[PDB]
Design a protein around this ligand. Sequence first.
Ligand SMILES: Nc1nc2c(ncn2[C@@H]2O[C@H](COP(=O)(O)OP(=O)(O)NP(=O)(O)O)[C@@H](O)[C@H]2O)c(=O)[nH]1
Ligand SMILES: [Mg+2]
Length: 221
Amino acid sequence: MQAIKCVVVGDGAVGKTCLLISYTTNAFPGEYIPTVFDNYSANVMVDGKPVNLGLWDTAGQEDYDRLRPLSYPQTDVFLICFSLVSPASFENVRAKWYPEVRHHCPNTPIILVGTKLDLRDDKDTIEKLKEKKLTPITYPQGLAMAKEIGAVKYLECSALTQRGLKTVFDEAIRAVLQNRHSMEISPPVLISSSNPTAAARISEAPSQVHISTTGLIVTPP
Ligand SMILES: Nc1nc2c(ncn2[C@@H]2O[C@H](COP(=O)(O)OP(=O)(O)NP(=O)(O)O)[C@@H](O)[C@H]2O)c(=O)[nH]1
Ligand SMILES: [Mg+2]
């Protein structure tokens, strides 16, 4: 089975973990728990042929800067995420995440993902940004940032509503499997995860992330 490794990076609180849990299990977690590393191993069918996705979640906090690149070797595609309602997270795409990824991985494709699409029209969110002379990030603004960092695609989504969500992962797959026509991609079947919320939905005992000689590995429950 062809395997694809995808690593998700971006500022704290932009919605990386919810993106992964929502896509892989159609659930949306109930308490914000900061990530260290987590793995999701999910299968899809691309034009009727199985492909394994190895999805890696990372910590957005700067305290994990030294450790985070442990996840990077052998990555096939990065998702750099920012919240559509956090201008700071948007600027950090350029200031922090693009350089960090590119310095480690000069040739790996990047998809730029704007998250929390469901908040872009939220009155309270808009007003709070306006108090600070700011606005939610617009689609053209995200597109421009994607061009500045040489991302292969710019995509917007909500983990909460799932608008745009399948497309993020399908386009990540398409960006990797450049020889495939990839006309149709099935929803994912989660096989294993180290995230307790996601692992519980395979049932409905998480795997464990460990350091190994070869980088990060997963040990079964
Ligand atoms: N409305 C809305 N809230 C979202 C969405 N995605 C995430 N959130 C919320 O945003 C907060 C952070 O989400 P989370 O996925 O934990 O973010 P993270 O990027 O993994 N943070 P870290 O680097 O610290 O692990 C949570 O309160 C979560 O419910 C979304 O699509 N819409
Ligand atoms: Mg997280």
